[PDB]
Amino acid sequence: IVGGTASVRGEWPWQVTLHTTSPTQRHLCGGSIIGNQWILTAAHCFYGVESPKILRVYSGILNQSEIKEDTSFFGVQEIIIHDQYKMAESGYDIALLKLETTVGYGDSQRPICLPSKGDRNVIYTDCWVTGWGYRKLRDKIQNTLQKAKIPLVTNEECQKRYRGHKITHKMICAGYREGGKDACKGDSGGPLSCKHNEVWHLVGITSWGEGCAQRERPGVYTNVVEYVDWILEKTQAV
């Protein structure tokens, strides 16, 4: 996160840190708890991940230093990547992790609501991007979970900013015209959380951008409202 501040413990209880153990253990991506065995994250996070056996999901984490060999985590039973996904820049950058065990909800770990079908017309004015990502293009994973408040940008304005790309309505953009605050490396897969009627909604999944927090380069996010039926197809399968 560029231009952000330290989060307070319990502030983003749906935020997870997804770690890989191959070749060595390190943070790989962010993610969001959406159900008691479900993490919603970005499909591009699994490039070269050949098995869910190398993955560890840690919930209830503020500081990466809380993670040691004796720290509990959730194993991943299954990685479900949208079958139309090719790359982050072409969209469908969404994936589900089915956990080996059930998340017990509490003040440190709980789900974020998915957006409503009727809420595709609501104007979100209170949106925040969170993660342990870089504070600049050449940096390192941060110890403390960071947060930054970012305004949503119309699809038309986002398309003007990304000449040569196709910004679809399955994407949603966020950023200040003068830059300064944005997601960066290590934040991808994490949430873009917006508060409406005193309820937080998972509006976006951190996906891609040209550089980090550059002037007139908003962050591009998976527009979660456009994937609610796909999420329900996968999580509510009979």
């Binding site: 959406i34 159900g35 008691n36 479900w38 059930t102 789900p111 609501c113 998915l114 957006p115 409503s116 009727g118 309820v199 609610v228 999420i231 329900l232 999580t235 509510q236």
Partner: peptide, 7 residues
Amino acid sequence: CTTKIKP
């Protein structure tokens, strides 16, 4: 939430 994910 209005959208529900089954436990």
